[PDB]
Design a protein around this nucleic acid. Structure first.
Lengths: 190, 150, 84, 129, 158
RNA sequence: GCUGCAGUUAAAAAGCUCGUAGUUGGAUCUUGGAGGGUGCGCCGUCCCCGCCCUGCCUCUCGGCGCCCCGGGGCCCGAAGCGUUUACUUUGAAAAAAU
């Protein structure tokens, strides 16, 4: 119920409950169970896409992700179908640590890991938002109006799973960072 | 460009972007770490392990299929040897040049070259020492160097 | 240099002619392949330029010799690239 | 080798505009290059720029109009004392009226006008007009 | 430890008296030496060694008769050749306008070092405090040993 | 000749390289609304300021207080207090004559 899988320091509910139930629904089965069972989730958040189909974002412990990666496509396919009208995906909760000041104080708290920096984390978010494709490259555009836009290049193959999504990834990303993201396709070295 | 000559030459790896992959790469961390350790048993250097792994068996970079550089893998198993390999091959090279110069006292080129090599060594050791790898007070000496490299 | 290129989107053809280090954003110019030799049926992955002898799984065979550059594959052999 | 990276970016720009060029690719970029490119941008001296992400140190493409006579870098990064800023802008700016000295202060990389208004000071990066 | 007392004169803290006495256990009494100490002030913790110790050192800021007043300085330990005293090197920046770059410059400062501090080893950064003339050269006394195994160039342990 | 010099031929790059001191060192770790100065005849124009469209902890000590059986634990000012600096900024301390 709420207790097990919607935990991570808060019980709660509603959607988390629905999705969890959906996972159980999937759980009845074969190889489409036992493999999942281990997987667990911290929380779910829902945020929309501009005309109005919402996207559902799921949070993962991070040690878990390799396994989630293991399934992903098949699971997402199920969650989109059972829960339709939403774009489902998977993001790992990452900690982020503040850069020390100085007088922040500083009781030289244990170093911290780049694998804890806000930029690194955000990069991870970008990596997580799209899936099996791969981010081929990136560029940043400085708009006349002091604005910045990040062009995130994408692979080509197997993309289709993401193609329809793109707009949500942009919106979702915004909700998290407040930065603007855009997507593109390549090229194929020759 | 270059340190002990006027050579310019740009030349390199050119390492790949793609964050992940290879994808056509199955195997596993398990697999190649075993592979690495077994090769290092045989006496192979990390450069050498990376090459042979690269060409014979699928490993584009050992880093990527395992979050660790080959040397770090070796050291963690307990395969790291006494001085870093670059320093080794330098010391060994200055040895072979030194042996050749003892044979042929008439070769001024060789004497020049020996100096160059030796300077490169002393600076490298200064760097390793600054960085704990070598005990502060480490030095390379002709006398003892011969005995050191083998 | 006539005050005309889109340094940001350069052409794939003239990007493909340039040095690996001179490429817009860098990238290599080398590849991997699967290699055959009828007697066996399984397939060894090989690196385009190779230095090492590469021998097959079992049969002391051959499977290219090295050179200045790309390994020269040996006589009666076949090879799909290839991935991403 | 390299001591600074800014000086290269700035020079590269200046030679682009001198040729009659409308774009450049600078390498390798840095937070400081971005910040400087940005101050330039706010003021009009360049168009829009783009940081391309090699898995290395970066490469920037700047699209430039042609309002730029010169963007220089000052090395070393001398300390300036609020009434050495008045002395700097006079040394290296065309008329009292325009052109900016851009420095780095505790409270941000800024053009000296913004410096005067905040009322902070620091070490001098460079300039343009 | 090493027998302190070593010299020819009986080392003692002034006006801190004894009197051992008869009856059983101890025997006399167990500590056998009353010890007097004080905190320097300025929030410098008086290290345990001072309180725990047998050593005499009049010159000690914690155990001895010296007051710390005046400049509080920090420097890097260049020498620990002399007994109970060290030499520290103080780097400072000299500003030259006439055209403007100033050039690193340094001064060495002799400073007394209480036996309470140990591992005073060259390389260690140390915080010394001004004091009354201890010796013709020495104006200062080591108040705090800043330390660090860090500076990694080796790996310190505990 | 710092700012602000010249050195192919005018006065001036050591025959060449190694090299310690010294100097010099890549990218990368946080993201209108009103207060006060002087112009113009109750109205406004034009600066300047905290904002909209990130010091932790304590809670040798003290207690704001939260939970336990004299024993405990925990946990605005003050306190703990600074990771070191340089830098720059705001103060004081800054002889009169000049």
């Amino acid at each position: 119920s709420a207790k097990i899988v919607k935990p991570n320091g808060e019980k709660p509910d509603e959607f988390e409950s629905g999705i969890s139930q959906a996972l159980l629904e999937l759980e009845m089965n074969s190889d489409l169970k036992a493999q999942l069972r281990e997987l667990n989730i911290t929380a779910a958040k829902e945020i929309e896409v501009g005309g109005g189909r919402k996207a559902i974002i799921i949070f993962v412990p991070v040690p878990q992700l390799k396994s989630f990666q293991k399934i992903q496509v098949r699971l997402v396919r199920e969650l989109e179908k059972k829960f339709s009208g939403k774009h489902v995906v998977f993001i790992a909760q990452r900690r982020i640590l503040p850069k020390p000041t100085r007088k922040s104080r500083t009781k030289n708290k244990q170093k911290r890991p780049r694998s804890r920096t806000l930029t690194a984390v955000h990069d991870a978010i970008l990596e997580d938002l799209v899936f099996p494709s791969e981010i081929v490259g990136k560029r940043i555009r400085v708009k006349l109006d002091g604005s910045r836009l990040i062009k995130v290049h994408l692979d080509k193959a197997q993309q289709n799973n993401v193609e329809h999504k793109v707009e949500t990834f942009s919106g979702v990303y915004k909700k998290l960072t407040g930065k603007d993201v855009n997507f593109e396709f390549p090229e194929f070295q020759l | 460009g270059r340190m002990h000559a006027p050579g310019k030459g740009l030349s390199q790896s050119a390492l790949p972007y793609r964050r992940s992959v290879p994808t056509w790469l199955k195997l596993t961390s398990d697999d190649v770490k075993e592979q690495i350790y077994k090769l290092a048993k045989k006496g192979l250097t990390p450069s050498q392990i990376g090459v042979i792994l690269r060409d014979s068996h699928g490993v584009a970079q050992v880093r990527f299929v395992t979050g660790n550089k080959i040397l770090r893998i070796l050291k963690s198993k307990g395969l790291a040897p006494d001085l870093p390999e670059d320093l080794y091959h330098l010391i060994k090279k200055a040895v072979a040049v030194r042996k050749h110069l003892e044979r042929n006292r008439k070769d001024k080129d060789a004497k020049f070259r020996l100096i160059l090599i030796e300077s490169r060594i002393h600076r490298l050791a200064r760097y390793y020492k600054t960085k704990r790898v070598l005990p502060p007070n480490w030095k390379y000496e002709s006398s003892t160097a011969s005995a050191l490299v083998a | 240099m006539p005050l005309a290129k889109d340094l940001l989107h350069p052409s794939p053809e003239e990007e493909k002619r340039k040095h690996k280090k001179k490429r817009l954003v860098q990238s290599p110019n080398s590849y991997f392949m699967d290699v055959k030799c009828p007697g066996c049926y399984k397939i060894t992955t090989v690196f385009s330029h190779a230095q090492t002898v590469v021998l097959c799984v079992g049969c002391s065979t051959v499977l290219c010799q090295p050179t200045g550059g790309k390994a020269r594959l040996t006589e009666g052999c076949s090879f799909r690239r290839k991935q991403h | 080798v390299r001591m600074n990276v800014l000086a290269d970016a700035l020079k590269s720009i200046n030679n682009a505009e001198k040729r009659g060029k409308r774009q450049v690719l600078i390498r390798p970029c840095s937070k400081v290059i971005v910040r400087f490119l940005t101050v330039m941008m706010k003021h009009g001296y360049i168009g829009e720029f783009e940081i391309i992400d090699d898995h290395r140190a970066g490469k920037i493409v700047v699209n430039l109009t042609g309002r730029l006579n010169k963007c220089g870098v000052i090395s070393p990064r001398f300390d300036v004392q609020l009434k050495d800023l008045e002395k700097w802008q006079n040394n290296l700016l065309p008329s009292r009226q325009f052109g900016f000295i851009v420095l780095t202060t505790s409270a941000g990389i800024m053009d000296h006008e913004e410096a005067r208004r905040k009322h902070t000071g620091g070490k001098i990066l460079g300039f343009f007009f | 430890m090493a027998d302190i007392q070593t010299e020819r004169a009986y080392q003692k803290q002034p006006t801190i008296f004894q009197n051992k006495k008869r009856v059983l256990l101890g025997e006399t009494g167990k500590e056998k030496l009353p010890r007097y100490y004080k905190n320097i002030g300025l929030g410098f913790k008086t290290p345990k060694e001072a309180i725990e110790g047998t050593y005499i050192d009049k010159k000690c800021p914690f155990t001895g008769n010296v007051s710390i007043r005046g400049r509080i300085l920090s420097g890097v330990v260049t020498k620990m050749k002399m007994q109970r005293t060290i030499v520290i090197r103080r780097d400072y920046l000299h500003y030259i306008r006439k055209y403007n770059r100033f050039e690193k410059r340094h001064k060495n400062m002799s400073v007394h070092l209480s036996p309470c501090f140990r591992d005073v080893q060259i390389g260690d950064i140390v915080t010394v405090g001004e004091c009354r003339p201890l010796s013709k050269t020495v104006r200062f006394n080591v108040l705090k040993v800043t330390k660090a195994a860090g500076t990694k160039k080796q790996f310190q342990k505990f």
